[PDB]
From a paper:
Protein tyrosine phosphatases (PTPs) play a critical role in regulating cellular functions by selectively dephosphorylating their substrates. The ∼280 residue PTP catalytic domain consists of an α/β structure, and biochemical and structural studies have led to a detailed understanding of the catalytic mechanism (Barford et al., 1994; Zhang, 2002). Key features of the domain include the PTP signature motif, the mobile Trp-Pro-Asp “WPD” loop that in the closed conformation positions the conserved and catalytically important aspartate residue, and the phosphotyrosine recognition loop. Here we report the crystal structures of 22 PTP domains, including two tandem-domain RPTP structures and a detailed structural comparison of this protein family.
Residue numbers in the entry: 246 to 313, 325 to 528
The structure:
């Protein structure tokens, strides 16, 4: 229909109104892993309550992703943004973190370690984190973290870090079963926590693997609500997440993996 075709064209020009100015500020240069991968201003996570000695303390390379449960899509920490990451988790009341990379893959730093070892605690600026217990699953490790603001023990909350460990160094997994099982656990944990904030998801840039995990999670949530017969539109979902953070889902293999994951999920429901 003409209405449909034209509206579709018009929606595609909306992104010309987005800006990425905050991420290009001189003070924020050293807070981006990739100079060309920056958060949209209108969905970026804005950090309040930073060190007043820092001229710019409100910036992290992260965006809120609301399907239209919400998400924060962010890059893996740099050595200098670990304190900022924990400020974000506290402020947003996030209770679940999904780490989709190893710290180092193929000689490259994807994420600086931002958690304490099991049974230890660390202060990251004003934030105190205790690692109470770790559980090693086949494809991932779960770390039960307790996060609080120093001098305010009453603010302590549990943050569950789901660290996916077996994504391959090149390409995507050749079967989606491990990812789906992982995502099912993340889903049940989030739904168990009253007033939990957005689920934090990261990879080195916060777009490729992050986007893949987020898009799969959104689609399987639709299938949970609407059943295996519901309509699914992968391209419209990717367009909706890309309106909130540019570039989500970076490769054709990632794109195919999303399709495979959704179909596998449907078949699991038919088997169970």
């Amino acid at each position: 229909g003409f209405w449909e075709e034209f509206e579709t064209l018009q929606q595609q020009e909306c992104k010309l109104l987005y800006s990425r100015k905050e991420g290009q500020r001189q003070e924020n240069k050293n807070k981006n892993r990739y100079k060309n991968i920056l958060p949209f201003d209108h969905t970026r996570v804005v950090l309040h309550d930073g060190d007043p000695n820092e001229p710019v303390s409100d910036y992290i390379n992260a965006n809120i992703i609301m399907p239209e449960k919400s998400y924060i899509a962010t890059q893996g920490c740099l050595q200098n943004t670990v304190n900022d990451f924990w400020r974000m988790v506290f402020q947003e009341n996030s209770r679940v973190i999904v780490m989709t990379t190893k710290e180092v893959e193929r000689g490259k730093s994807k994420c600086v370690k931002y958690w304490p070892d099991e049974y230890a605690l660390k202060e990251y600026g004003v934030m105190r984190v205790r690692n109470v217990k770790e559980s090693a699953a086949h494809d991932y490790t779960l770390r039960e973290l307790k996060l609080s603001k120093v001098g305010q023990g009453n603010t302590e909350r549990t943050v569950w870090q789901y660290h996916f460990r077996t994504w391959p160094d090149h390409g995507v997994p050749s079967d989606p079963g491990g990812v789906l099982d992982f995502l099912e656990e993340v889903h049940h944990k989030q739904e168990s926590i009253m007033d939990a904030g957005p689920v934090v998801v990261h990879c080195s840039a916060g777009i490729g693997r992050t986007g893949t995990f987020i898009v799969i999670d959104i689609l399987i949530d639709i299938i949970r609500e609407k059943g295996v017969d519901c309509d699914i539109d992968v391209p419209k979902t990717i367009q909706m997440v890309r309106s909130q953070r540019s570039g989500m889902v970076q490769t054709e293999a990632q794109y195919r993996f999303i399709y495979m994951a959704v179909q596998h999920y449907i078949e699991t429901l038919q088997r169970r």
